[PDB]
Design a protein around this ligand. Structure first.
Ligand SMILES: N#Cc1cccc(CN2CCc3ncn(Cc4ccc(Br)cc4)c(=O)c3C2)c1
Ligand SMILES: N#Cc1cccc(CN2CCc3ncn(Cc4ccc(Br)cc4)c(=O)c3C2)c1
Ligand SMILES: N#Cc1cccc(CN2CCc3ncn(Cc4ccc(Br)cc4)c(=O)c3C2)c1
Ligand SMILES: N#Cc1cccc(CN2CCc3ncn(Cc4ccc(Br)cc4)c(=O)c3C2)c1
Ligand SMILES: N#Cc1cccc(CN2CCc3ncn(Cc4ccc(Br)cc4)c(=O)c3C2)c1
Ligand SMILES: N#Cc1cccc(CN2CCc3ncn(Cc4ccc(Br)cc4)c(=O)c3C2)c1
Ligand SMILES: N#Cc1cccc(CN2CCc3ncn(Cc4ccc(Br)cc4)c(=O)c3C2)c1
Ligand SMILES: N#Cc1cccc(CN2CCc3ncn(Cc4ccc(Br)cc4)c(=O)c3C2)c1
Ligand SMILES: N#Cc1cccc(CN2CCc3ncn(Cc4ccc(Br)cc4)c(=O)c3C2)c1
Lengths: 180, 179, 180, 173, 178, 178, 180, 179, 180
């Protein structure tokens, strides 16, 4: 039951006019394909006007999440990340991949970087190869939070969520706002 | 739910991707995908048979004959084809990736490329699956410019490659971070 | 989601294929697929009875009477019917492929062509009727491949797939091409 | 999805050609659809012939009888066409065409044998209706229809023409 | 599970020793096979000692009910029938197939002869008429009613009282106590 | 629950009567059990007759031929009995009894028409090759011509016990013990 | 509903006393484990008394069928094979593996050596490796029917059944009996 | 349906196999199989801790920790253990096969041996599955007497070996046709 | 099928295990598993209250109250309880393993020991009650490992498995042996 706003759009097509790419729910190849297209389209309108990326996600397929991350680094626009409700697993990696100084979170959000043990693989993968994927998140997290590799590997072995202030000091987000 | 963009006409974002001469290959490859992909490749040729066409690949593989149908159409049309790998391209997905126009096969830094065949259509006999696998042997060796047994060995290995190993191996030409 | 192309008018890409006089026979063939193909075949003739009609065949087979229904329409209309095998043409697919206008039956370089029938039909069927069906499959195959009736009874007993070059040598198609 | 011709969809264009399709199993939903178009094509013209495309394995008898009564009610000449097969109730509509205008394409299969909650006496009562319909349009005696419908087999289009189910077996116009 | 009685049998094997054959529940080929074997076993014990049958059945496959009916008419033992709870469709045909004067029913039972709308395969129209005509003749032979009266009463989708079924001919005695 | 007689279960005592029970659809499991009892009953005596009880709707053709071949292999004379029905493979086994010892009860239903399964999906020439095997067995035991058999089996109908007797499927139609 | 015969056994335990190993139905690891135990037990009673192996099977897992074959060659007893009803795929390979001159079939049996295209693999296997398994049946069939490798490979490409007389001339069985 | 044999006692054929000091390992390996196999290995030791025990292996693999539990019990008891491979022994199945007493690891001529791990218990983390795989690396190298990386390479290969290659590789000692 | 052993009397091998004073805790632990273990525990004590009792633990965990029910019985009875970890002991499995008599908690060389609880119980449960349960898990773990309560709160936050040597160093078991 999606509404229509006023030439008349639906509320989700209107969100894209305000340069807002929506990432709600589990991440798969279909979500990654839709998100990457919105980013590439938004750069075609202007490669300097900022883009806001709303994240309320529990995670999902890693390669699908990495495709969004790789596209976030490709486009030249300033990328603003907003954590609403929760950003866990791959969701917190996209949250931490925003433009430095523009990664926000709402005051009552939860943030998880631990990886779950409901998909995460597309096909069946071998023992050495989930380790290579985990090492990829090890370096991406360390690069965007400016944390050491050992601190990152240690923190990701603990099954717990952080408050936006804990995530701020760790390096996932920059500002915790209740109001503009 | 597919959003709508305005650039006066109103397209869905995927009808707008086809406007950019961009053909998406996301997900498992079956006869439904092969019918959709081939149609866009034939349409994009009709608009202009010399402008390049971009193929985005994030696929785990799938039906072999459908992936071979796309590949044949890729070699049939006259446009230079740029391949782009985001996320992953495993089994038949890496074959289409390596089948791009030489010099314009790209991948993004965190993609995973697998050429090991998994384990499609109706079940067949042992001589037919072995016949099909040798076509995958020849096609890979044709575009990687590797030896046959070098390909046959690398395909036994249950493993993915980083975009860089796939570049030295001959599946890719460029690994980009930024334009 | 089926994409949209623009001339001016907005078409769906499959509807644009029909304006190029291309009739797709993709996937398993049943009565619903037969209805669509026959409807498109008869419409393309009403526009012009001499302009060629293109048939895209990527099929693993299907119901015999449904596949025969199409073949009956391909023989009825006066248009030159170019058959194109892309991917594979098995069981009822190769019969339609071999039923194209002589000299205009093509195949793409990596296609597989089988004439072996699978080990069906709409309602449960008797012994004498199944062999009556296979006997008219022999006659149509022998008519269009110009082969002996027993050479069609043979080789159809072989659980085997053919190359486009074998299928060209045997009489199913006339050309196998890489480029136009 | 069904394509678009010029702006019509291919099955709406087939209706503009005065062609009514009866493809697949016949039930009350299909019978309601066929009857609606049969009355519309008569509403457009009561003289122009109407073409019926039959590719059916049969279906519900009361639904097939519903179509049959409508073709007898309407005043238009009706051409039936068999493509693929016409089995059980499907061959009854095929034989229900206007005399001299019942066709079949060469490689079709015609079945009049009926496939093996109402009482037993109602099954026999419905069957006798089927017997009389077949005998009326085939000009065959009742015991010939009863003995032939008893045989679990399909016919060639040439066999079905001599029996009286159809009139024309053509390859080209 | 079924309990164990000591005299050590399970109770259903003990009803066998009392020459009681149970026809409880729906009738299929598995029930007919079990019932016929119990009948033929009791004739081998003594062809003269009566056999008691307990019928609490909603009906079932017609050919299975005929194999039971043909087996009781085969053996020469005196066969009683006892309607407990309900005897509908094939159940009431067997109930009426008892030895004349020895077909009983308990007072609060329901007896039905109208046939439902019986499948091993899907059959043709004349084959369900051929089968129904067998039910007509079997009912008329044991109820001593005219064939027309059978066709009328079987067309009514209704249940009979054990009192009504007595004067119709389906049973002989409606008792509360021995 | 199968009752117990005195310690046998009723189906084990049927085997002691030299009776082999073939009730229900015929598959490879039914064929294995039936063949096992036929060879056992031959082990205890190669000349005493064996009794076969047939209430079958048909089943797998190769399993039904597996039984038939074993009925022809053993040296014992075989009485076949039809109760309820004998259809498709069931009527072929019924017809394959010892000449003059194939019986049926009066309310049985016998069909030789084959249904429109089998362990694997097979080809056209194999399904028809199997039908010719049935053509020869039916003509052999009914002593009818090949054309008369292949015509009559394309009829979708059942026969009465007397029709099948005149056709050659069975010999005696009994109501009470001879 | 398995009967009891007379000390009292069940009819299947009695079959083993007559030195009859029963192979009915599709073949899996459970059937192979049960069959191999009966063969090894029967050799422990006497390594010279013959063993009869009843076969009414449509096939099954290849490695499970090969385990029975390998055990048939291990034990020293004369092995008699009996085809009843049908022996297809792996079933006909065990039928052909009997002691020379002791492979029988009942007069109305069907024999298939073609391999189906309902299991045949335990796990998932690669393209080259089904070829190695097929080459194993290629040599086993040729060794026991004394046929050439080319004749064996050709005959196994045809989807058809043979009569016991066809199978006798080919080399699967030695005698076709109606009576001892 | 398990038959009954007489040799006076009445056993089922599998209770008679345990009488021969024969332990069967057929089918997928889970905690139910590990509980059954370990119990027989411990019982057969109690009857006599020096008589050999025979293990028949026709398994496609399965749960790793259950297959490791059996292997540990194999090394724990004091009896020499003969392993026998019929049909196949893939993944954990070949590990138990190679874990027999040196000199008595056999296979029949038409068996297939796979040491490539497939793709068990609850799902785990990437460091734990990698930790488990290295125990399979050490155990295989211990009984094959091969190098670690030689094992690690051979385990990438999606392939089976004939009993003869498995013999040169160090998983087997003897390949028999007849006693 | 559970095999049969013979002394003389015929036992099923699992019943023979109970006569060796061995109680198996294999698989997931629920109320039905708790009933069996407690019943076997109390019976073995009725025969003798000083003879050791052996507990075989190959468990991935289960219900907390069901697992606590066993631990309560292990503390109640007077017998020396030797715990044996074979394969794995995770969640409630390691708690029973660590609850064995001091000096008699063993593990086999290739076992995995986890104390991390999974991300349950019989009926749907509230927040305060789940933490009340984890708090008594802390107390039992701290009592038997002789570790600090916070050292138990830590490390239990780590989605991690331990070796038998780590579990010995931490206090879950006392010995890790290859041979008796
Ligand atoms: N997966 C994917 C992916 C991710 C990052 C970069 C690329 C490279 N490609 C190559 C071809 C191309 N062509 C046009 N544009 C502009 C545009 C305009 C509108 C829309 Br709607 C979409 C794109 C591009 O940005 C690119 C970048 C691929
Ligand atoms: N499977 C398929 C397939 C794949 C490759 C080539 C062909 C050959 N065919 C034959 C007829 C034809 N006719 C028109 N065009 C132009 C066109 C314009 C618009 C659209 Br929308 C699609 C195509 C063709 O490209 C071809 C090629 C078949
Ligand atoms: N199944 C079917 C089928 C197959 C072959 C031949 C026929 C015969 N029929 C009879 C009536 C008819 N009426 C009009 N046209 C032209 C037309 C115009 C638009 C569309 Br859209 C479709 C057809 C015909 O071709 C025919 C041929 C039936
Ligand atoms: N079931 C039904 C059915 C079948 C046959 C005949 C009838 C009788 N009815 C009664 C009323 C009626 N009113 C208008 N028209 C013309 C018309 C115009 C457009 C459409 Br669209 C449909 C019909 C009629 O034909 C009839 C015939 C009922
Ligand atoms: N369906 C069936 C059926 C129904 C009625 C009659 C028959 C005929 N048969 C033939 C052979 C036979 N042999 C022995 N007895 C005695 C007996 C003893 C114990 C048990 Br337990 C079962 C039977 C017979 O009654 C018959 C009758 C078959
Ligand atoms: N399928 C099957 C089948 C069918 C017919 C004949 C045979 C041949 N076999 C071979 C070996 C054999 N050995 C012993 N006996 C006697 C016997 C005794 C008790 C039982 Br219990 C079962 C059999 C045999 O009859 C045969 C006949 C197989
Ligand atoms: N899979 C399996 C299989 C198949 C063929 C041969 C072997 C080798 N084994 C080794 C140990 C062994 N020990 C005792 N016996 C005799 C026997 C007695 C009774 C029964 Br019951 C079972 C066997 C043996 O035959 C063997 C042969 C394994
Ligand atoms: N999981 C498990 C497992 C695996 C290997 C070793 C052990 C240690 N345990 C400890 C207690 C014990 N007590 C008696 N015996 C002898 C025996 C006698 C009959 C049967 Br039946 C089973 C065993 C033992 O072998 C052991 C070994 C545990
Ligand atoms: N849940 C439970 C449970 C757990 C711990 C303690 C108790 C207390 N109960 C009370 C009554 C009782 N009565 C007899 N015995 C001895 C015995 C003998 C044979 C078997 Br078999 C089992 C026990 C007891 O140990 C107890 C202890 C309950």
């Amino acid at each position: 039951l999606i509404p229509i706003v006023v030439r008349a759009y639906d509320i989700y097509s209107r969100l894209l006019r305000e340069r807002i790419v929506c990432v709600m729910g589990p991440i798969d190849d279909s979500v990654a394909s839709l998100v990457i297209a919105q980013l590439l389209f938004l750069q075609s309108e202007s490669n300097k006007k900022p883009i806001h990326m709303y994240i309320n996600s529990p995670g999902g397929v890693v390669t699908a999440g990495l495709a969004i991350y790789d596209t976030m680094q490709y486009i030249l626009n300033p990328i603003c990340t907003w954590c609403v409700g929760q950003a866990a697993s791959m969701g917190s990696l996209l949250l931490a991949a925003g433009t430095p100084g523009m990664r926000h979170s709402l005051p009552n959000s939860r943030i998880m970087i631990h990886q779950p043990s409901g998909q995460a693989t597309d096909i069946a993968i071998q023992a050495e190869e989930i380790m290579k994927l985990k090492k990829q998140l090890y370096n991406i997290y360390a690069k965007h939070t400016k944390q050491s590799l050992q601190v990152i590997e240690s923190a990701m072995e603990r099954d717990r969520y952080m408050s936006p202030m804990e995530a701020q000091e760790f390096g996932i987000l920059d500002k915790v706002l209740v109001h503009p």
